[PDB]
Protein backbone atom coordinates (compact mmCIF):
# COMPACT_ATOMS: atom_id res chain seq x y z
CA UNK A 1 0.00 0.00 0.00
CA UNK A 2 1.12 3.52 -0.90
CA UNK A 3 2.76 5.50 1.90
CA UNK A 4 2.86 9.29 1.97
CA UNK A 5 6.68 9.06 1.85
CA UNK A 6 6.83 7.06 -1.40
CA UNK A 7 6.99 10.15 -3.67
CA UNK A 8 9.93 11.62 -1.72
CA UNK A 9 11.69 8.26 -1.61
CA UNK A 10 11.21 7.87 -5.36
CA UNK A 11 12.80 11.31 -5.84
CA UNK A 12 15.84 10.01 -3.95
CA UNK A 13 15.84 6.95 -6.22
CA UNK A 14 15.67 9.16 -9.30
CA UNK A 15 18.62 11.14 -7.98
CA UNK A 16 20.61 7.93 -7.57
CA UNK A 17 19.66 6.87 -11.10
CA UNK A 18 20.79 10.21 -12.53
CA UNK A 19 24.07 9.82 -10.68
CA UNK A 20 24.62 6.28 -11.99
CA UNK A 21 24.10 7.60 -15.54
CA UNK A 22 26.29 10.68 -15.05
CA UNK A 23 29.71 11.41 -16.49
CA UNK A 24 31.25 11.09 -13.00
CA UNK A 25 30.81 7.29 -13.10
CA UNK A 26 30.97 6.64 -16.84
CA UNK A 27 34.34 4.88 -16.78
CA UNK A 28 32.76 1.89 -14.97
CA UNK A 29 29.01 2.40 -15.56
CA UNK A 30 29.02 2.10 -19.35
CA UNK A 31 28.47 -1.70 -19.59
CA UNK A 32 25.21 -1.20 -17.70
CA UNK A 33 23.77 1.59 -19.86
CA UNK A 34 21.81 -0.61 -22.30
CA UNK A 35 20.46 -4.16 -22.41
CA UNK A 36 23.08 -6.84 -22.95
CA UNK A 37 23.06 -7.60 -26.69
CA UNK A 38 24.02 -11.23 -26.29
CA UNK A 39 24.17 -12.08 -29.97
CA UNK A 40 26.32 -9.05 -30.79
CA UNK A 41 28.76 -9.97 -28.01
CA UNK A 42 28.89 -13.65 -29.04
CA UNK A 43 27.36 -14.65 -25.69
CA UNK A 44 24.93 -17.20 -27.06
CA UNK A 45 24.20 -18.73 -23.64
CA UNK A 46 23.32 -15.43 -21.92
CA UNK A 47 19.54 -15.85 -22.08
CA UNK A 48 19.77 -19.48 -20.95
CA UNK A 49 21.56 -18.34 -17.78
CA UNK A 50 19.89 -14.95 -17.14
CA UNK A 51 16.10 -15.21 -16.76
CA UNK A 52 15.40 -11.51 -16.14
CA UNK A 53 17.76 -9.10 -17.95
CA UNK A 54 18.05 -5.60 -16.55
CA UNK A 55 20.03 -2.45 -17.35
CA UNK A 56 19.99 1.25 -16.50
CA UNK A 57 18.08 2.35 -19.62
CA UNK A 58 15.27 -0.01 -18.60
CA UNK A 59 15.32 1.35 -15.04
CA UNK A 60 15.16 4.87 -16.48
CA UNK A 61 12.20 4.00 -18.73
CA UNK A 62 10.39 2.41 -15.79
CA UNK A 63 11.01 5.50 -13.64
CA UNK A 64 9.84 7.86 -16.41
CA UNK A 65 6.69 5.75 -16.92
CA UNK A 66 5.89 5.74 -13.18
CA UNK A 67 6.22 1.96 -13.13
CA UNK A 68 8.01 1.88 -9.79
CA UNK A 69 5.55 2.36 -6.95
CA UNK A 70 8.15 2.46 -4.17
CA UNK A 71 11.87 2.62 -3.55
CA UNK A 72 12.23 -1.08 -2.79
CA UNK A 73 10.88 -1.97 -6.25
CA UNK A 74 13.45 0.33 -7.87
CA UNK A 75 16.27 -1.10 -5.73
CA UNK A 76 15.29 -4.65 -6.66
CA UNK A 77 15.79 -3.87 -10.37
CA UNK A 78 19.16 -2.19 -9.78
CA UNK A 79 20.32 -5.12 -7.69
CA UNK A 80 18.98 -7.59 -10.31
CA UNK A 81 21.17 -5.87 -12.89
CA UNK A 82 24.26 -6.39 -10.73
CA UNK A 83 23.29 -9.95 -9.78
CA UNK A 84 22.96 -10.89 -13.45
CA UNK A 85 26.50 -9.62 -13.98
CA UNK A 86 27.83 -11.67 -11.03
CA UNK A 87 25.94 -14.77 -12.22
CA UNK A 88 27.03 -14.76 -15.85
CA UNK A 89 30.61 -13.48 -15.81
CA UNK A 90 33.68 -14.97 -14.12
CA UNK A 91 34.45 -13.12 -10.88
CA UNK A 92 37.81 -11.81 -12.19
CA UNK A 93 36.28 -10.29 -15.36
CA UNK A 94 36.73 -6.54 -15.86
CA UNK A 95 32.96 -6.12 -16.05
CA UNK A 96 32.57 -7.61 -12.56
CA UNK A 97 35.09 -5.12 -11.16
CA UNK A 98 33.06 -2.36 -12.82
CA UNK A 99 29.82 -3.75 -11.38
CA UNK A 100 31.26 -3.84 -7.87
CA UNK A 101 32.32 -0.19 -8.12
CA UNK A 102 28.97 0.97 -9.48
CA UNK A 103 27.13 -1.11 -6.89
CA UNK A 104 29.17 0.60 -4.16
CA UNK A 105 27.98 3.96 -5.51
CA UNK A 106 24.42 2.68 -5.47
CA UNK A 107 24.38 1.00 -2.07
CA UNK A 108 25.97 3.83 -0.12
CA UNK A 109 23.60 6.43 -1.57
CA UNK A 110 20.54 4.17 -1.35
CA UNK A 111 21.36 3.73 2.35
CA UNK A 112 20.90 7.52 2.77
CA UNK A 113 17.22 7.24 1.77
CA UNK A 114 15.03 9.71 3.66
CA UNK A 115 12.70 7.68 5.88
C1 LIG B 1 26.90 -6.05 -18.22
C2 LIG B 1 27.50 -7.40 -18.56
O1 LIG B 1 27.40 -8.34 -17.81
N1 LIG B 1 28.20 -7.56 -19.77
C3 LIG B 1 28.36 -6.53 -20.78
C4 LIG B 1 27.31 -5.73 -21.23
C5 LIG B 1 27.54 -4.82 -22.23
C6 LIG B 1 28.81 -4.72 -22.80
C7 LIG B 1 29.06 -3.74 -23.90
C8 LIG B 1 28.31 -2.62 -24.24
C9 LIG B 1 28.94 -2.07 -25.32
N2 LIG B 1 29.98 -2.81 -25.63
N3 LIG B 1 30.07 -3.85 -24.75
C10 LIG B 1 29.85 -5.53 -22.37
C11 LIG B 1 29.60 -6.43 -21.36
C12 LIG B 1 30.67 -7.43 -20.83
N4 LIG B 1 31.88 -7.38 -21.59
C13 LIG B 1 32.91 -6.44 -21.25
C14 LIG B 1 32.69 -5.41 -20.36
C15 LIG B 1 33.70 -4.54 -20.03
C16 LIG B 1 34.95 -4.68 -20.61
C17 LIG B 1 36.05 -3.71 -20.24
N5 LIG B 1 36.86 -2.98 -19.95
C18 LIG B 1 35.17 -5.71 -21.51
C19 LIG B 1 34.16 -6.58 -21.84
C20 LIG B 1 30.01 -8.79 -20.94
C21 LIG B 1 28.81 -8.87 -20.01
C22 LIG B 1 27.74 -9.87 -20.50
From Swiss-Prot:
Q: Tell me where on the tree of life, at the top rank, the source sits.
A: Eukaryota
Per UniProt, what does mutating residue 41 to A do?
A: Reduced binding to histone H4 acetylated at 'Lys-12' (H4K12ac)
What's the impact of mutating residue 89 to A? Abolished binding to histone H4 acetylated at 'Lys-12' (H4K12ac)
Q: Which residues form the Bromo domain?
A: 8-113
- Cellular localisation: Nucleus; Chromosome
Record's comment describing the protein's domains: The first bromo domain specifically recognizes histone H4 acetylated at 'Lys-12' (H4K12ac). It also specifically binds histone H4 acetyl-methylated at 'Lys-5' and 'Lys-12' (H4K5acme and H4K12acme, respectively). The second bromo domain recognizes and binds histone H4 acetylated at 'Lys-5' and 'Lys-12' (H4K5ac and H4K12ac, respectively).
Q: What is the protein's known function?
A: Chromatin reader protein that specifically recognizes and binds histone H4 acetylated at 'Lys-5' and 'Lys-12' (H4K5ac and H4K12ac, respectively), thereby controlling gene expression and remodeling chromatin structures. Recruits transcription factors and coactivators to target gene sites, and activates RNA polymerase II machinery for transcriptional elongation.
* Complex formation: Homodimer. Interacts with E2F1. Interacts with (acetylated) STAT3; promoting STAT3 recruitment to chromatin. Interacts with CTCF; promoting BRD2 recruitment to chromatin. (Microbial infection) Interacts with herpes virus 8 protein LANA1.
- Other noteworthy facts: Some specific inhibitors of BRD2 that prevent binding to acetylated histone are promising therapeutic molecules for the treatment of cancers or inflammatory diseases. ABBV-744, a small molecule, has been tested on tumors with success: ABBV-744 antiproliferative activity is mainly restricted to cell lines of acute myeloid leukaemia and prostate cancer and is able to displace BRD4 from chromatin. GSK046 (iBET-BD2), which specifically inhibits the second bromo domain, is a promising therapeutic small molecule for the treatment of inflammatory and autoimmune diseases.
Family classification: Belongs to the BET family.
In Swiss-Prot or TrEMBL terms, this protein is called Bromodomain-containing protein 2
Name the species this protein comes from: Homo sapiens
| Organism lineage | Eukaryota, Metazoa, Chordata, Craniata, Vertebrata
**Gene that produces this protein:** BRD2
**What range of the full-length protein does this chain span?**
348 to 455 of 801
Amino acid sequence: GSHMQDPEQLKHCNGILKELLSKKHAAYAWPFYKPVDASALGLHDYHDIIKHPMDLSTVKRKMENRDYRDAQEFAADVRLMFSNCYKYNPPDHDVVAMARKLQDVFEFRYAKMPD
